């Protein structure tokens, strides 16, 4: 797994789970969603509702303050988003939609209107029209070709053309079709409900050639100059012709995408065949069938695929990259097929983590930082974790099902909250489509508006974290960390927390500076670790540890991997305006990195308390580690305590980048996150405490922890807000 999942709820920082500026247009979104890049370098998001009666638009980089527009439709489209198109013509979002009754609706939405404050819209922003009789021959797929021309596909197998004469009116330009004549055979009828070989995917090549994929997996190719069938390939008669079962595709989906003159096609054989040839002159020429690596019966459905230029992956042997998004229920799967060379015979499948760190930690009870105790403490915890949109949707579902909080301390209620919150989140995060943010940034758009998932290329350390129970090889450092995790994973959460606390205590002086390091480690050991682990695992850890050259590995870990670089500014494109998207993506990514760092650092420190490692030789490392552990803890605490505030102080930390950043590739993003890491390990805490004072229970531990004169003051006032206050 070379990529990780970073989840983004664009409204997370704000209390209102809805933008104040929402406008409802009417014509006389949890079923499809996508992003589209516009002339102004902005991404517009759109959602088509379950019923296909509501279309919603909102600006990716300004969801809360920007305008979201709901366009209400008189009836549903004939066949969902598949009978809908959206393209930017000239400073306008042109949207066409064949409705159920047969009408062909046109929408014209000025770009300005999409980024204005206005709640009104002038002029003819919509046109109804009946160019063809769709009662008899029902369409199911609408494909945009040009501002004036676009084709319609029909359920029975026929194509209709649609040519724009003036600015509004459309007329049918019919294609010659003699396929139907297979009705003459005893094996097909015109009247039969089966037998249809309708189009399920379609792409435009060089403005002129129209490549269509049919339900029987025929690749037909139409020349729009001639309006004539030029090619007809049977994709299946190439590979092992299975007489048992080839699943004729029973719905429109994303079964092909082309880059330059290459073309991948998705064929169903255990839902596992990526054919890919080349287009050239028109001739399609096969190269290879690349199967999938999917098990659990192979029960994943394609959501979206995107063939494109190669990424910066851990195998330099690369020529092209296919990004692939599967789904199974609300569970998703992101993979990248890397093809090495111009022969499509050498390739490699690259998997990714399909759950975010926060989620994995919550599931596997690996979260050490989140404060325990009170029921209302848990309330703040979940509220802060999930965001208001989810938390309130969950409280809605609770009261609907007649689950009502008995009293202040109803733990039985909170229990229910955990799950409903998780489920709501999971639902909201159901995958719908892929967007290539920037040049190469893999973005997934979810069913619930304001919910996106970015898939981020992992750094070295992140790859180690995410592949402990996998990596066959690995460097010495990986193996060392792996063995440390091998021991530490046997300890329980309470023990680990008490140890973390003690490491804070060394810094706060609660473990007096008067003590030697050895004495503090002995204290820690006796109070926290003694009788709390199996001696067999200790022996194991010691043995494995003796194979390593510890000073070197620790050197590489501390001074290269974990301690970031001095920058002479390496272009983190300065944002002119606040970008809520990159803001939350940055904060979540930072949180993942520092969480991983935290777990490593703690495991190493643990090894320093357990064994007789010369406290003088490693003194430098020990104190650096305790400093880093301390800073990590602090940051993570502030993160789950008040994300908005943290973001605000962490971006008002960098002067030249006060408004935020833009990143168009993975390198710029990684470098920016690293930059923030640097900020943390080296003004934030002050701006945060200040803005906060102008999260009460918080800064008690965080004036016991994050305090260690000013600290006394803060403790004295937060405790006034009484004997302790006056005394201090």
């Amino acid at each position, epitope marked *: 797994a070379c990529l990780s999942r970073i989840d983004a709820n664009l409204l997370q920082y704000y209390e209102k789970p809805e933008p104040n500026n929402t406008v409802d247009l009417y014509v006389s979104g949890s079923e499809y969603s996508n992003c589209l890049l516009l002339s102004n370098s902005e991404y517009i998001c759109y959602h088509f509702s379950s019923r296909s009666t509501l279309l919603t638009f909102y600006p990716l980089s300004d969801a809360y303050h920007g305008k979201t527009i709901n366009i209400h439709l008189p009836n549903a489209s004939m066949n969902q988003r598949y009978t809908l198109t959206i393209q930017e013509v000239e400073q306008q979002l042109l949207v066409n939609v064949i409705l159920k009754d047969g009408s062909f609706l046109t929408l014209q939405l000025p770009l300005s209107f999409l980024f204005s404050s206005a709640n009104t819209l002038n002029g003819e922003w919509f046109h109804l029209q009946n160019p063809y009789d769709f009662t008899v021959r029902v369409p199911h797929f609408l494909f945009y070709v040009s501002p004036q021309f676009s084709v319609v596909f029909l359920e029975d197998g026929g194509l209709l053309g649609l040519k724009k004469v003036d600015g509004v009116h459309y007329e049918p330009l019919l294609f010659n079709d003699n396929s139907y004549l297979k009705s003459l055979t005893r094996f097909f009828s015109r009247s039969s409900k089966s037998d249809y070989d309708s189009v399920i995917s379609c792409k435009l090549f060089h403005e002129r050639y129209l490549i269509v994929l049919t339900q029987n997996c025929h690749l037909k190719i139409w020349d729009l100059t001639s309006f004539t069938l030029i090619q007809d390939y049977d994709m299946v008669s190439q590979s092992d012709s299975d007489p048992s079962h080839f699943r004729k595709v029973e719905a429109v989906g994303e079964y092909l995408s082309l880059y330059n003159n290459t073309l991948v096609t998705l064929l169903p054989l255990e839902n596992g065949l990526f054919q890919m040839g080349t287009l050239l002159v028109l001739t399609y020429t096969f190269q290879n069938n690349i199967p999938t690596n999917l098990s659990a019966s192979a029960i994943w459905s394609i959501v979206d695929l995107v063939l494109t230029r190669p990424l910066e992956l851990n195998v330099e042997a690369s020529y092209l990259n296919l990004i692939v998004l599967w789904k199974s229920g609300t569970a998703s799967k992101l993979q990248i097929l890397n093809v090495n060379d111009e022969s499509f015979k050498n390739y490699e499948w690259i998997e990714s983590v399909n759950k975010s760190l926060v989620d994995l930690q919550s599931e596997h009870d690996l979260d050490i930082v989140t404060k325990t105790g009170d029921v209302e403490r848990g309330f703040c915890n979940l509220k802060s974790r999930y965001g208001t949109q989810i938390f309130e949707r969950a409280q809605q579902i609770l009261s609907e099902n007649k689950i009502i909080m008995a009293h202040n301390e109803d733990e039985e209620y909170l229990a*229910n909250l955990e799950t409903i919150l998780r489920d709501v989140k999971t639902a909201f995060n159901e995958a719908s489509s892929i967007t290539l943010y920037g040049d190469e940034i893999i973005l997934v758009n979810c069913f619930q508006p304001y919910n996106h998932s970015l898939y981020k290329l992992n750094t070295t350390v992140e790859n180690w974290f995410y592949n402990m129970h996998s990596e066959t090889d690995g460097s010495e450092l990986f193996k060392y960390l792996r063995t440390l995790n091998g021991f530490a994973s046997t300890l329980s959460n309470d023990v680990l927390r008490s140890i973390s606390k003690k490491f804070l205590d060394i810094i706060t002086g609660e473990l007096p500076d008067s003590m030697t390091t050895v004495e503090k480690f002995t204290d820690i050991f006796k109070n926290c670790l003694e009788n709390q682990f199996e001696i067999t*695992n200790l022996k194991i850890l010691f043995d494995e540890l003796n194979s390593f050259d510890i000073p070197v590995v620790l050197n590489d870990l501390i001074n290269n991997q974990m301690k970031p670089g001095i920058f002479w500014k390496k272009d983190f494109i300065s944002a002119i305006k606040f970008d809520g998207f990159t803001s939350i993506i940055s904060l979540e990514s930072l949180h993942q990195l520092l969480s991983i760092h935290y777990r490593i650092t703690l495991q190493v420190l643990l090894t320093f308390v357990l064994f007789d490692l010369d406290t003088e030789i490693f003194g430098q490392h020990i104190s650096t580690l305790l400093d880093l552990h301390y800073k990590q803890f602090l940051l993570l605490n502030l993160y789950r305590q008040d994300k908005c505030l943290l973001a605000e102080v962490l971006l008002k930390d960098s002067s030249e980048f006060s408004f935020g950043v833009k990143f168009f590739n993975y390198g710029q993003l990684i470098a920016y996150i690293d930059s923030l890491n640097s900020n943390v390990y080296n003004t934030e805490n002050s701006f945060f405490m200040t803005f906060f004072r102008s999260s009460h229970k918080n800064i008690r531990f965080f004036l016991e922890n994050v305090e260690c004169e000013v600290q006394e003051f803060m403790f004295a006032m937060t405790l006034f807000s009484f004997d302790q206050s006056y005394e201090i």
Partner: antibody
Amino acid sequence: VQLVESGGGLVQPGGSLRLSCAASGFNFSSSSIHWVRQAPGKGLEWVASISSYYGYTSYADSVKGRFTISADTSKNTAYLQMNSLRAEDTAVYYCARYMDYWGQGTLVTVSS
Amino acid sequence: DIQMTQSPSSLSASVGDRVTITCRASQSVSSAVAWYQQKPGKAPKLLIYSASSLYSGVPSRFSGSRSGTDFTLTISSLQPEDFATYYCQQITFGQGTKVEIKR
């Protein structure tokens, strides 16, 4: 793919038995081997596991100090050495790996 | 030690009936919960892992879900080959739900 379990049977109480579980058709060296037992007419009881990958072992309270789990990666074989056996230890023991792959199980009678 | 309760301890149902088996954790285990089916005289077969993931090859009539500390195994349409003892698991196991084909 198949686990194999040999070495149970009848054993006098206070006595000893070594169970073997010979594995194949998966990566033994990165798997975890568990031993799970079922007393006549009762439910499943997890007693022990070992990480091939790091040797890490652990035990249910009911068997700690009497049972030793071990593993030889070079013959893809794991072991459970059972000492000071008790009537409470009769049952059928399985061997599972992580639990996707299960031993056909071998029955251990402690009595006389 | 964690205690996994199951309810009911023994149920009975028609072929084609929808069957619900519940499991309650003594403490609060996270979604680290698996469901197994055991025929008598044979090794348990994994059905569900991570509370709601369907294990490879298992019929889709079996599903798992969670509500707080309550875990649910559902058989959407009971078949005559489905009589068995079903177990939840977090390591500790449930006491075991025994189903048969009600008459």
